[PDB]
Write an enzyme that holds these catalytic residues in place. Structure first.
Site, PDB file in Angstrom:
ATOM      1  N   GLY A  81      34.374 -40.221 -10.123  1.00 44.45           N
ATOM      2  CA  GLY A  81      35.606 -39.664 -10.622  1.00 44.45           C
ATOM      3  C   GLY A  81      35.526 -38.161 -10.767  1.00 44.45           C
ATOM      4  N   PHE A 113      34.766 -34.853 -12.521  1.00 48.17           N
ATOM      5  CA  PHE A 113      33.800 -34.381 -13.513  1.00 48.17           C
ATOM      6  C   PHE A 113      32.911 -35.521 -14.014  1.00 48.17           C
ATOM      7  CE2 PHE A 113      37.611 -31.577 -14.219  1.00 48.17           C
ATOM      8  CZ  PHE A 113      37.104 -30.486 -13.546  1.00 48.17           C
ATOM      9  N   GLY A 114      32.526 -36.423 -13.120  1.00 49.68           N
ATOM     10  CA  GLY A 114      31.726 -37.537 -13.581  1.00 49.68           C
ATOM     11  C   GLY A 114      31.585 -38.712 -12.637  1.00 49.68           C
ATOM     12  N   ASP A 115      30.433 -39.363 -12.719  1.00 48.13           N
ATOM     13  CA  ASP A 115      30.090 -40.481 -11.859  1.00 48.13           C
ATOM     14  C   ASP A 115      30.377 -41.788 -12.587  1.00 48.13           C
ATOM     15  OD1 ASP A 115      29.294 -39.621  -9.302  1.00 48.13           O
ATOM     16  OD2 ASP A 115      27.354 -38.910 -10.072  1.00 48.13           O
ATOM     17  N   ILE A 116      30.792 -42.802 -11.834  1.00 49.01           N
ATOM     18  CA  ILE A 116      31.150 -44.099 -12.402  1.00 49.01           C
ATOM     19  C   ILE A 116      30.117 -45.142 -11.989  1.00 49.01           C
ATOM     20  CG2 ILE A 116      32.855 -45.926 -12.439  1.00 49.01           C
ATOM     21  CD1 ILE A 116      34.696 -43.155 -11.705  1.00 49.01           C
ATOM     22  N   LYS A 172      31.631 -44.419 -17.198  1.00 47.03           N
ATOM     23  CA  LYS A 172      31.694 -43.057 -16.696  1.00 47.03           C
ATOM     24  C   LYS A 172      30.695 -42.202 -17.472  1.00 47.03           C
ATOM     25  CE  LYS A 172      34.863 -39.371 -15.218  1.00 47.03           C
ATOM     26  NZ  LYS A 172      36.265 -38.832 -15.095  1.00 47.03           N
ATOM     27  N   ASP A 214      46.493 -35.886 -10.186  1.00 46.40           N
ATOM     28  CA  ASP A 214      45.642 -36.300  -9.087  1.00 46.40           C
ATOM     29  C   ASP A 214      46.123 -37.630  -8.528  1.00 46.40           C
ATOM     30  OD1 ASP A 214      43.711 -36.003  -7.225  1.00 46.40           O
ATOM     31  OD2 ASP A 214      42.045 -36.670  -8.480  1.00 46.40           O
TER      32      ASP A 214
END
Lengths: 7, 289
Positions: free
Chosen positions: B17, B19-22, B37, B127
Site C-alpha cells: 500500500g 507508505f507501507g507493506d501489507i 499493514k 488514489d
C-alpha cells in the site's frame, strides 16, 4: 511507474 | 514465532500500500486471517495511525473494512484489518482483462457509492484505482469495498463545511495512469477528481488498456509528462468511441465540475442505471467471476 505511487 | 500484537502471526507479503507493506496474518486466538499493514516506527513522515483514525471515522459505512488492532511493536507501527477478497485489478486479470458491460455497470454503481460515502465523511480518497477496491467474503461477496486511506485528506471543515482552499502548482502524489487531468496540472484535488479517476477506471475495464498506458521513456518524470500530454490530447469522445455514450457523458460531467462543487452523485448513478435497464440486464449481482 505508471501505476506505482509516485509524483 | 513471529507475532505482532502478541496475537497475529505474520505471513507472506500480499501487496504494498501507500507508505507501507501489507502482510497476510492469522489471528491465533480465532484462526481468522487478517491483513497487517506495517510502517517503520522511525519514519520521518508517520501516517499509519492517521490512516487508522480515518478508518475509524469511516466505520459503519457499507464497504469499509473493520480495524481489528492498531499499535506499535519492534521496528513498526502496526495496523491489523479485516482480510477481504481479491481486488478489482486481480479479478480483471482473472477474467482475461475483459469485463462484460453488465459487470462494469454493477461495479460503477457501487464505486460511486463508496466514493460518495467517503465524501459525506468530509474526505477525498485521492488514489482511486482498481487495486484499491476489493470484494467482500462469503455473504459479502457481492459487495465492493474501498481501501487505502493513506492519501486521504479532508476537503471540507467538519462543522462549517467550509471547503478547503483552491491551490495550484502542487507536485502531487497519485497513480499516473488514473489521475485526473487537474492533478496533472498541479491543482488541489477535491471531490470532482475522485469521480474523474473512477471514469478512467471504467474505461480501463472497458478497453483492457488505456491510450496513455504502456508508453516508452527513460526518466520517471518524463514518463509522467508523456502520460500527462497523451491523456490531455485524447478527447473523451475518441477514448470512448464504440461504447455506450454514458461513459463519455460521465467523464465529460466530471471534468466540468468546479473545484468546490458538490457532485450530483444521483445523476451519475442514474446514467448507468438507465443504460443497465435499457440493456435488459437484471440487478441480480452476478458478476463475470
Amino acid at each position: 511507474d505508471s501505476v506505482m505511487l509516485g509524483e | 514465532e513471529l507475532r505482532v500484537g502478541n496475537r497475529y502471526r505474520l505471513g507472506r507479503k500480499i501487496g504494498s500500500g501507500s507508505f507501507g507493506d501489507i502482510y497476510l496474518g492469522t489471528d491465533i486466538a480465532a484462526g481468522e486471517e487478517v491483513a497487517i499493514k506495517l510502517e517503520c516506527v522511525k519514519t520521518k513522515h508517520p501516517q499509519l495511525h492517521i490512516e487508522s483514525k480515518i478508518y475509524k471515522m469511516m466505520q459503519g459505512g457499507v464497504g469499509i473494512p473493520t480495524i481489528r488492532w492498531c499499535g506499535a511493536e519492534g521496528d513498526y507501527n502496526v495496523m491489523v484489518m479485516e482480510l477481504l477478497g481479491p481486488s478489482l485489478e486481480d479479478l480483471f486479470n482473472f477474467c482475461s482483462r475483459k469485463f462484460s458491460l453488465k459487470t462494469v455497470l454493477l461495479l460503477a454503481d457501487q464505486m460511486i457509492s463508496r466514493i460518495e460515502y467517503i465524501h459525506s465523511k468530509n474526505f477525498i480518497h485521492r488514489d482511486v484505482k482498481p487495486d484499491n477496491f476489493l470484494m467482500g467474503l462469503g455473504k459479502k461477496g457481492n459487495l465492493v469495498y474501498i481501501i487505502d486511506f493513506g492519501l486521504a485528506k479532508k476537503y471540507r471543515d467538519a462543522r462549517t463545511h467550509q471547503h478547503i482552499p483552491y491551490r495550484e502548482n502542487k507536485n502531487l502524489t497519485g497513480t499516473a495512469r488514473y489521475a485526473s487531468i487537474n492533478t496533472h496540472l498541479g491543482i488541489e484535488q477535491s471531490r470532482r477528481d475522485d469521480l474523474e479517476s473512477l471514469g478512467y477506471v471504467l474505461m480501463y475495464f472497458n478497453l483492457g488498456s488505456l491510450p496513455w498506458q504502456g508508453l516508452k521513456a527513460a526518466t520517471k518524470r518524463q514518463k509522467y509528462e508523456r502520460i500527462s500530454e497523451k491523456k490531455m490530447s485524447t478527447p473523451i469522445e475518441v477514448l470512448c468511441k464504440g461504447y455506450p455514450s454514458e461513459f463519455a457523458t460521465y467523464l465529460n460531467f466530471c471534468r466540468s465540475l468546479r473545484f468546490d462543487d458538490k457532485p450530483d452523485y444521483s445523476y451519475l448513478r442514474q446514467l448507468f442505471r438507465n443504460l443497465f435497464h435499457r440493456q435488459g440486464f437484471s440487478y441480480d449481482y452476478v458478476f463475470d467471476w
